[PDB]
Amino acid sequence: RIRIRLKAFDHRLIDQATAEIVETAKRTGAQVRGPIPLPTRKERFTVLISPHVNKDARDQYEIRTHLRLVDIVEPTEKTVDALMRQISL
Protein backbone atom coordinates (compact mmCIF):
# COMPACT_ATOMS: atom_id res chain seq x y z
CA ARG A 1 0.00 0.00 0.00
CA ILE A 2 2.47 2.63 1.23
CA ARG A 3 5.73 2.37 -0.73
CA ILE A 4 8.76 4.25 0.62
CA ARG A 5 11.51 4.64 -1.97
CA LEU A 6 15.05 5.74 -1.15
CA LYS A 7 18.20 6.50 -3.13
CA ALA A 8 21.89 6.75 -2.32
CA PHE A 9 25.32 6.60 -3.96
CA ASP A 10 27.51 4.24 -1.93
CA HIS A 11 26.63 0.57 -1.51
CA ARG A 12 27.35 0.56 2.23
CA LEU A 13 25.45 3.86 2.49
CA ILE A 14 22.28 2.47 0.92
CA ASP A 15 22.74 -0.72 2.96
CA GLN A 16 22.88 1.15 6.28
CA ALA A 17 20.00 3.40 5.18
CA THR A 18 17.80 0.40 4.41
CA ALA A 19 18.99 -1.20 7.66
CA GLU A 20 17.86 1.83 9.67
CA ILE A 21 14.56 1.84 7.75
CA VAL A 22 13.92 -1.86 8.40
CA GLU A 23 14.95 -1.43 12.06
CA THR A 24 12.43 1.34 12.68
CA ALA A 25 9.94 -0.73 10.64
CA LYS A 26 10.39 -3.71 12.97
CA ARG A 27 10.07 -1.21 15.83
CA THR A 28 6.72 0.15 14.63
CA GLY A 29 5.44 -3.30 13.61
CA ALA A 30 2.48 -3.73 11.22
CA GLN A 31 4.27 -6.65 9.47
CA VAL A 32 6.73 -4.76 7.28
CA ARG A 33 8.42 -6.84 4.60
CA GLY A 34 12.11 -6.52 3.89
CA PRO A 35 13.90 -4.11 1.57
CA ILE A 36 13.48 -4.46 -2.19
CA PRO A 37 16.70 -3.57 -4.05
CA LEU A 38 16.16 -2.44 -7.64
CA PRO A 39 18.73 -2.38 -10.49
CA THR A 40 20.72 0.84 -10.52
CA ARG A 41 20.93 3.22 -13.48
CA LYS A 42 24.35 3.45 -15.14
CA GLU A 43 24.84 6.94 -16.60
CA ARG A 44 27.96 6.54 -18.74
CA PHE A 45 29.33 9.16 -21.12
CA THR A 46 32.76 9.71 -22.67
CA VAL A 47 34.61 13.02 -22.49
CA LEU A 48 37.57 14.21 -24.55
CA ILE A 49 40.32 15.09 -22.08
CA SER A 50 42.42 17.71 -23.86
CA PRO A 51 40.91 20.61 -25.82
CA HIS A 52 43.04 19.85 -28.89
CA VAL A 53 43.80 17.02 -31.30
CA ASN A 54 43.51 13.70 -29.44
CA LYS A 55 40.71 11.20 -30.04
CA ASP A 56 42.05 8.12 -28.24
CA ALA A 57 42.16 10.23 -25.04
CA ARG A 58 38.66 9.75 -23.61
CA ASP A 59 37.82 8.78 -20.04
CA GLN A 60 35.05 6.48 -18.79
CA TYR A 61 32.87 7.74 -15.94
CA GLU A 62 30.38 5.54 -14.07
CA ILE A 63 27.24 6.56 -12.17
CA ARG A 64 25.82 3.95 -9.78
CA THR A 65 22.88 5.46 -7.90
CA HIS A 66 21.30 2.77 -5.74
CA LEU A 67 17.49 2.90 -5.67
CA ARG A 68 15.64 0.68 -3.20
CA LEU A 69 12.18 0.65 -1.65
CA VAL A 70 10.16 -0.83 1.20
CA ASP A 71 6.46 -1.60 1.52
CA ILE A 72 3.81 -1.02 4.19
CA VAL A 73 0.59 -3.03 4.06
CA GLU A 74 -1.46 -0.56 6.13
CA PRO A 75 -0.52 2.96 7.30
CA THR A 76 -1.13 3.59 11.01
CA GLU A 77 -0.36 6.29 13.56
CA LYS A 78 2.87 4.57 14.62
CA THR A 79 3.91 4.32 10.96
CA VAL A 80 3.26 8.02 10.39
CA ASP A 81 5.19 8.74 13.61
CA ALA A 82 8.12 6.73 12.25
CA LEU A 83 7.70 8.74 9.05
CA MET A 84 7.74 12.15 10.77
CA ARG A 85 10.32 11.19 13.42
CA GLN A 86 10.04 9.37 -1.73
CA ILE A 87 6.53 8.38 -0.59
CA SER A 88 3.76 6.71 -2.59
CA LEU A 89 0.31 6.16 -1.10
Binding site: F9, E43, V47, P51, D59, Q60, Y61, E62, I63
Partner: protein
Protein backbone atom coordinates in the same frame (compact mmCIF):
# COMPACT_ATOMS: atom_id res chain seq x y z
CA UNK B 1 33.43 32.58 -23.43
CA UNK B 2 33.75 36.33 -22.88
CA UNK B 3 31.96 38.62 -20.44
CA UNK B 4 30.10 40.10 -23.42
CA UNK B 5 29.11 36.60 -24.57
CA UNK B 6 27.82 35.63 -21.13
CA UNK B 7 25.92 38.93 -20.98
CA UNK B 8 24.40 38.05 -24.36
CA UNK B 9 23.45 34.62 -22.99
CA UNK B 10 21.81 35.97 -19.83
CA UNK B 11 19.92 38.69 -21.72
CA UNK B 12 18.82 36.06 -24.25
CA UNK B 13 17.42 33.77 -21.56
CA UNK B 14 15.83 36.79 -19.84
CA UNK B 15 14.10 37.88 -23.06
CA UNK B 16 13.03 34.26 -23.63
CA UNK B 17 11.47 34.06 -20.16
CA UNK B 18 9.80 37.43 -20.75
CA UNK B 19 8.33 36.77 -24.22
CA UNK B 20 7.78 33.02 -23.81
CA UNK B 21 4.04 33.12 -23.10
CA UNK B 22 2.80 35.16 -26.07
CA UNK B 23 5.14 33.27 -28.40
CA UNK B 24 3.74 30.03 -26.97
CA UNK B 25 0.16 31.15 -27.66
CA UNK B 26 1.17 32.23 -31.17
CA UNK B 27 2.74 28.81 -31.81
CA UNK B 28 -0.38 27.15 -30.39
CA UNK B 29 -2.76 29.04 -32.68
CA UNK B 30 -0.38 28.33 -35.58
CA UNK B 31 -0.39 24.59 -34.83
CA UNK B 32 -4.19 24.57 -34.41
CA UNK B 33 -5.21 24.62 -38.09
CA UNK B 34 -8.95 24.08 -38.57
CA UNK B 35 -10.08 27.51 -39.80
CA UNK B 36 -9.27 31.23 -39.51
CA UNK B 37 -6.76 31.79 -42.30
CA UNK B 38 -6.76 35.53 -41.56
CA UNK B 39 -6.15 34.85 -37.86
CA UNK B 40 -3.25 32.58 -38.85
CA UNK B 41 -1.97 35.48 -40.95
CA UNK B 42 -2.26 37.75 -37.90
CA UNK B 43 -0.43 35.14 -35.81
CA UNK B 44 2.42 35.29 -38.33
CA UNK B 45 2.06 39.10 -38.13
CA UNK B 46 2.66 39.14 -34.38
CA UNK B 47 5.40 36.51 -34.69
CA UNK B 48 7.27 38.65 -37.22
CA UNK B 49 6.84 41.84 -35.19
CA UNK B 50 8.33 39.84 -32.32
CA UNK B 51 12.14 40.02 -32.62
CA UNK B 52 14.22 37.06 -33.76
CA UNK B 53 15.52 36.48 -30.21
CA UNK B 54 13.65 34.97 -27.22
CA UNK B 55 13.22 31.43 -28.53
CA UNK B 56 14.73 27.96 -28.01
CA UNK B 57 16.06 28.37 -31.55
CA UNK B 58 18.23 31.16 -30.13
CA UNK B 59 18.91 29.29 -26.88
CA UNK B 60 22.41 27.82 -27.27
CA UNK B 61 22.89 26.74 -23.59
CA UNK B 62 26.68 27.01 -23.52
CA UNK B 63 28.83 26.54 -20.41
CA UNK B 64 28.17 28.59 -17.29
CA UNK B 65 31.46 29.29 -15.50
CA UNK B 66 33.62 29.16 -18.65
CA UNK B 67 31.10 29.91 -21.41
CA UNK B 68 32.62 27.38 -23.80
CA UNK B 69 30.23 26.98 -26.77
CA UNK B 70 31.62 23.49 -27.48
CA UNK B 71 31.76 20.44 -25.25
CA UNK B 72 28.59 20.97 -23.22
CA UNK B 73 26.28 18.62 -21.31
CA UNK B 74 22.70 19.36 -20.27
CA UNK B 75 23.22 17.29 -17.09
CA UNK B 76 26.21 19.10 -15.55
CA UNK B 77 25.92 22.48 -17.28
CA UNK B 78 29.68 22.95 -17.70
CA UNK B 79 32.50 22.28 -20.15
CA UNK B 80 34.24 18.94 -20.70
CA UNK B 81 37.45 20.22 -19.11
CA UNK B 82 35.62 21.62 -16.10
CA UNK B 83 33.59 18.48 -15.43
CA UNK B 84 36.79 16.46 -15.85
CA UNK B 85 38.52 18.64 -13.25
CA UNK B 86 35.44 18.34 -11.02
CA UNK B 87 35.54 14.54 -11.17
CA UNK B 88 39.32 14.76 -10.72
CA UNK B 89 39.28 16.82 -7.53
CA UNK B 90 36.22 14.92 -6.29
CA UNK B 91 33.35 17.28 -5.48
CA UNK B 92 30.55 15.48 -7.34
CA UNK B 93 28.94 12.19 -6.21
CA UNK B 94 29.94 9.15 -8.23
CA UNK B 95 32.00 9.42 -11.44
CA UNK B 96 34.45 6.59 -10.85
CA UNK B 97 36.57 4.85 -13.48
CA UNK B 98 33.96 2.98 -15.52
CA UNK B 99 35.28 -0.54 -16.14
CA UNK B 100 32.92 -3.25 -17.35
Amino acid sequence: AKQSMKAREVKRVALADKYFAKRAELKAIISDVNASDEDRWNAVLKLQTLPRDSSPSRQRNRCRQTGRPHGFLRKFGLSRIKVREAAMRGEIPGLKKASW
